[PDB]
Symmetry: D2
Amino acid sequence: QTQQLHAAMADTFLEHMCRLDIDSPPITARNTGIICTIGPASRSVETLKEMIKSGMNVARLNFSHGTHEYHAETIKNVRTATESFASDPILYRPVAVALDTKGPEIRTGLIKGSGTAEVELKKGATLKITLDNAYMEKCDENILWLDYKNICKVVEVGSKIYVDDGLISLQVKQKGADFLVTEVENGGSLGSKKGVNLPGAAVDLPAVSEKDIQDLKFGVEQDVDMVFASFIRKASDVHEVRKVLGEKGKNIKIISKIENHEGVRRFDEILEASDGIMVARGDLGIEIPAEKVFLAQKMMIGRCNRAGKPVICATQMLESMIKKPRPTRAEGSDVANAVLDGADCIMLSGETAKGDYPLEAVRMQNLIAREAEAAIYHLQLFEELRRLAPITSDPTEATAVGAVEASFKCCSGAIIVLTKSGRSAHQVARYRPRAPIIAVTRNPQTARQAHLYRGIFPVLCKDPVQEAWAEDVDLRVNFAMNVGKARGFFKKGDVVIVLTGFTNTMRVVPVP
Amino acid sequence: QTQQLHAAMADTFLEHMCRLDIDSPPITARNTGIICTIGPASRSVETLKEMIKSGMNVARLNFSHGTHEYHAETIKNVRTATESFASDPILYRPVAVALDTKGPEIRTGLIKGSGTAEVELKKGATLKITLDNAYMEKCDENILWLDYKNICKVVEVGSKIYVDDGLISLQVKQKGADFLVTEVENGGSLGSKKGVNLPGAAVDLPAVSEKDIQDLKFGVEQDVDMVFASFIRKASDVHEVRKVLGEKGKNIKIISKIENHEGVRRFDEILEASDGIMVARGDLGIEIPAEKVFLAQKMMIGRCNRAGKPVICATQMLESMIKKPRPTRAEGSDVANAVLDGADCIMLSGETAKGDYPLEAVRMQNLIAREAEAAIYHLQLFEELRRLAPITSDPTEATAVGAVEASFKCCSGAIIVLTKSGRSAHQVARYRPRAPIIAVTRNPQTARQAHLYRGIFPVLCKDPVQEAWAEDVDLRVNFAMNVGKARGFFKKGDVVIVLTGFTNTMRVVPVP
Amino acid sequence: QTQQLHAAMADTFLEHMCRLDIDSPPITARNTGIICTIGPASRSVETLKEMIKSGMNVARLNFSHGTHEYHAETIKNVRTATESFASDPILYRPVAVALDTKGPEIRTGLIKGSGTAEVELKKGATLKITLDNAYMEKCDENILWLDYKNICKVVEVGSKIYVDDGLISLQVKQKGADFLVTEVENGGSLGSKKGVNLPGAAVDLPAVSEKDIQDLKFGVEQDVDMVFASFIRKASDVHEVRKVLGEKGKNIKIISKIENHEGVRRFDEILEASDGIMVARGDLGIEIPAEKVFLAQKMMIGRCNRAGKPVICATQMLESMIKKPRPTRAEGSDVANAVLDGADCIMLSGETAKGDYPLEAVRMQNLIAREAEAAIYHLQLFEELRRLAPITSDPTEATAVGAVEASFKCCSGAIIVLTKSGRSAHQVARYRPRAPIIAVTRNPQTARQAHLYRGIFPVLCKDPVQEAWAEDVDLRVNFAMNVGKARGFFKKGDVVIVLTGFTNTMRVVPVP
Amino acid sequence: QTQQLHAAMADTFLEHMCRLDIDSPPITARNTGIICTIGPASRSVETLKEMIKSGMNVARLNFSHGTHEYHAETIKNVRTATESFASDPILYRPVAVALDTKGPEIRTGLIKGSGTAEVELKKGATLKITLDNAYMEKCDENILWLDYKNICKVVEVGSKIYVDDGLISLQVKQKGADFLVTEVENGGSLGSKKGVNLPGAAVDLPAVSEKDIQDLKFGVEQDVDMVFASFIRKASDVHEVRKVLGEKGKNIKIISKIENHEGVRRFDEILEASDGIMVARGDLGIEIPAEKVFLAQKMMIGRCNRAGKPVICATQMLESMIKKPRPTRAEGSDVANAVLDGADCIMLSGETAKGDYPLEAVRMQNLIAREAEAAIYHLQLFEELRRLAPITSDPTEATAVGAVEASFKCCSGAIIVLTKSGRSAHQVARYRPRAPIIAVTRNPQTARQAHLYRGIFPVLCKDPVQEAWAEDVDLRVNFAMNVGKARGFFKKGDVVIVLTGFTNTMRVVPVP
């Protein structure tokens, strides 16, 4: 048995589970994109190359920390590492750059003497919180300076406040005039500049602030491919982000992050306005009750899938791997279930940004994802997506559905799509074919953005535009055709699907 | 609401029925082929032209009557009426000719005394049967001659003999040398040369006889498109008809007619050797109990639909119309239901061979069939043929499932197919698309044979072949593009699927 | 393989058809009830006993002919034959009495002063229609009188008029003011008092005429079980029949006959008001075009099944058998498809009212019905009837779905239900169990009315009530038990389901 | 909308996910059993009581640590905690005791003199493994002793050896007679007596060693309710446990733990010989690659569901909570997905055996599981289980599917089952009703073992047996009603299904 084809033949979803077999190997090609956060541990060109070698598709730069210089250098290294393989088109793996925005986050100040210094909060022990900037440099076990100045106006008496990943929780004994006197609920070591969450509270921090505008404009200067926009709450917040990106940045994909109750509620509004969604479980698990996350996640992946847009699952997928070389059984199951849910990309934060084993964590996700894709019940996924798919006037859309249906019949090895903007390829992916979609394009940016979609393998053709069109099409097709054989997606005999143009033509041919 | 689009969109089959609206006009394109037996009532060249305008697609010659001169003349008139519309591709409709063999049937002699003056076989009275040629034309209420010279060897006291399509039944009450002395079960009128049935007896008549050998060679000399073979009891039978049709008729489609118990048992063996099947309910309903015929029919249409081979439902579909201008409600229910079960073709015998309302009978099948195609539940159907269809390495087989999936997506006006042998079109049709399948060919015979498959509309091209293959292709695509708009299959703006080629190229293009 | 068990055990519906085996008989039990129209060919108390022995469950009295005296005699005979078996509880079968109204029908008058006179009509010939009562007995090939004194007010020039079940068709050439000049469209033999249809015309005849009012009151007087209401066009029509039956006739079941365009249009409104529906195909096929009748029938049966209300399929199911001892193939598949569609009962009109083979017709329907009831794909029918079935608080409803689910799971030989009004047996029956629903009641009328439902076998208990409760219940449960084993339903070991009380108790017990 | 009644009620699984709402609460009743390992952190009678209040249904005793004395005291406290609520049937909650065998596990010895001070092993360093008991309690970064005296014989040069949950990694460079020379793949800190895994090698230790026989016999003496058998490799191992348990322990449930490759390979025969299965992810993800664990899990849960046997998901479900008060997002997701897969019970090990937050750990599982249960897609689940479930002649099996169909059809607040052995309640549970299954029994051992099944709430009746069987029945039914009403399950109004006695009686009764 190969790539769980026995499990795929069952009539029921239950029979399908029963036939899943651990002694049935997947198809080398992994379809779920891997997004790694680049930080102190993965920043070197040297380790960065190993990362690309291990499976990284997108590099995430977290702008809640670090100066532009720091990030501009990170960006340069990501590109040095990526172009190191440019010599040969069979080794060249396009890598995209994504910018995560700080956004409307509330942070505590610097602990006494220095941030490295720590402190311990013990239960019951009240604690003082002032917006008095004299204490920012002096954060201690008795006084905690906040970042959000117009706090109290939004926090009533009795409410809660979670500091540091929500690990530390407090309780407002009374709303002060310009200060708060709390009481630890469950202490712990309070370092410095630890995020703060005000669930139940109605924060008014600007969706996009000054710092966000400069970082956002910086991304346009830097030529990033996508923006992960933090704390999106309404469709109007995404518009401000497009606005800022201006005309120069109009092609940058915008990924709205859902991290709170409102965003969850205004999801439909937000999805329509975005290019894609990121299920940002970290904050969302503090903003709403932790047992609800799985529901918000499946709700979001389901709708994005249905809508044909990228959805990224993120935060704490391999937490444990920050300190250890192997993941726990919960984390192992986490990644698999995300892929099986329908997530286009899975992500890594601390695991690659500051952990001791970023390469093992990237390698782990390539492994799990590959297994998880083989275990997908397509006979039901494809049938369900079609039935829910609107009746179209667009030829390319009918070409896409027709192409994925043929790929299941002849069990095809690949769906070669020639596209300039990537749309044709995106249209093929929403129907979730089992065959890999090799997207041949001359646009290096659409090639990078291809990674936000499940099953799209971008192959950047450099060859000059042939004088004659028919020839230029035949050229880009032999390109995929040779790089494909070279990369091992198929051999001279295999049947393959090819989509060219406006993309409205489909051909089922033998590999040359 | 139109073409049952409100119903063919329901989640359950029951729900589908509840939504059938008799006020929802169908698509002017009728998919089910109509086969008309020709005879005194339709032989006139002039009325033959009318049969065609009324919907006839295939002219059936019943070789169980008449001479080779007679049929040769029917064939000429049929071709005259057919080619009289050829002067214009917009009005031209190819008409196939079918040759129905007599096979091993058994008939009674001629009535004596007063003309054919039916004889009254009274219940309970005895009836002596002889093979003595002395009375071969002196039949009456006491003696009935028969042409089965080896009958006493396969009967016995108790045996049951059925006369004139099973309306008269006899029970052998005393065998003899060259005669039987039966007793009349339920009576009726006995006319001349009525067919006889021996259900339970082993009639040693050969599948193909010398007489049948003659006719088959005649069919080949005359250039028929298909042979409807009578009493196919085993795959061996079908193999003999192939031997005779030999090399010159190796292209003639052989439809095996199932009309006996053995044939229904060794059915799958028969379907393997045949190009198509025909449910001959006439004899079948005498050879097996009448109450079971509907089972044999739904089973054969079912197995033929899977197998992807043409199937024909025939005999007594509109009996009442031999004498009446309108059909009974049972007759209308019958035809509708045959189409709904999946019959590729419906056929008329007496109705057009000798009836008083041949034309009214053909128009009634066009009307019933059209309404029934709209009410089809393409939802469950398509998905079901997809599931039950084996995977293949075949390029054209996937380009078809692809063509059909994509035509459902964009409610395409039609699926245009360039093919030389027609297989390319037979492949799309086995998936039962809603959209009409226009087959464009230069081969006149494949145009005629396409009538045997549900949904294919023959559009025969005449323009010469361009040395420029590429160019030659657009010449025929446009061909169908005009004949299509004209006949009102679609409007310019519409979206159309074009399957060119070695058919591996599918295209979704807006009509010019 | 028996009762098509191999087939009902198939994943797909197409694979279900492929398994229908002609050599796989069912259970001697036939669920589809049979309604026979009583007439000259079947009134003899003698013939009525044979009708009952052949399968008749309901005697239908056509009040469009005969006097109250004539019908009191008919009813008297039916009850006489039915009670001839009342001596022995094992052979006693409740026969229901049905009164069918004349309703708003138009009939021509007498030919040449008599009701045995048949004039000949030639195509092309002209015919004058007059309303001068002085012609109601003066009808011939040049003049014709009609009941509808306001015919000219709704029939325009060019409108077509149908006489005698649509056999004769005329076209109005000169629309006057008191007379009409028509042209015979299709010839035929014209007899007296033939039915006339005016498709398109908006006839104003009362829903319930004065004659209808007397006949309905006569009904209550004669203690009939149901009323088949002709030409019902809307709910207020059904509400009139009810007002008439009044309190005294409040329990009589009312079946609305759908035989015109509007009844089909306002069907939902009509179903709400009626106790059940009859698909009167005869008139409907003349009122609306013939090619749409199956749509009307498939839709109506579908909706009644959804609603759990009896639905009857009628008219011309075995026409051929009026004059012949065997049905045509079209008639064979019509009676079967009627059952496969979901009709609670099938009917015979002329076949048993005036034909030559009343008994042969009945026996042929019992046969077809059984074969068709086994070929039923319950796997799909049951489940669709559940999803679509509403969530109630009613113990009995939940108990019925529970009982039917259990009957399939352990292949039960019967579901014995104890009911006074019949409602409990009705509720089990709407889910369509495969197992015969034996209904034990001490109430005679509900015993007879149970025939309107698919699969409810009425078994009337004549045994005196037990002074105690529990024991009375067992008296009845064991009653069903004895008669059950006796009539072949089951053996001594056999697993049965028993429902008792308010019916909220299910027991899966082996037969004693 | 409450309890995902809008979501858990769609026509496609995809649409189902899309409708999941974070703003719709579930039915207080949590159906998934929670097994908690007892250790230093949860051993007191004091915290045991709270654990029961938090949701613990089964107490697990890990026999790979601790003496018989120690474990006897644990059982004493659990029983003490449990009985403290005995003083009122409304608060009493049966709590089961589970014995988890040591089985053939390999462990390291003790680290050198310098406290349990773990040692640092670095990638590259060389480590020698000795079997010389002289170094038994003198372990260091240079020499490591193990208790598997045959390690050298089952290992080859190049094999892989994992230490401490598979965190430390070693590869054999040189194989000696009584030693090994390894090189460290990835290191870490190694404390004392850590588990060792040899993936690939065929460990020749017996499944049921001498200590195991002693421990199982201790389990019988102590009246444990179930046994979790470690490292079952084949059915002969399960039988070996059975013999040891003997007659006294013939009612003790045997749950086989699949934690190695032979176990997963021969799973079908193991499932057959066992009372239930436990997916032991801990060892299983070292034994086989971690990336494959999820497939194994979904396969076993799916096959146990299909077989109607209990299946438990275990190990590292909330790992994080050993040191933090809140779980990671992977862990939240993991627990939820285990419930959605079909796991009957979820387990906690370190989280409750030695972590700082046992009570929070247990409460968090109660929360996730509840949310998870409301989001189950019962439509498909029930349908498939019914499809995949065999046809039976057993009355109770039929009564059980009947009770579940009814309980859906009338939104029952519960299915009350009267059972002595637990059997009839187990039969209802396998069909997975939405409504909670209340099993009334006088038998304390079946009331405790009932926690092994999804949705079965044990209610142990204390009342004495009435002389009147039928009076005893209503006594027990009334007990459920009261304890049920009093516990929140339903109200005076609501409908409930009641099954009684061979459980072949069902009654839909409103709550008194």
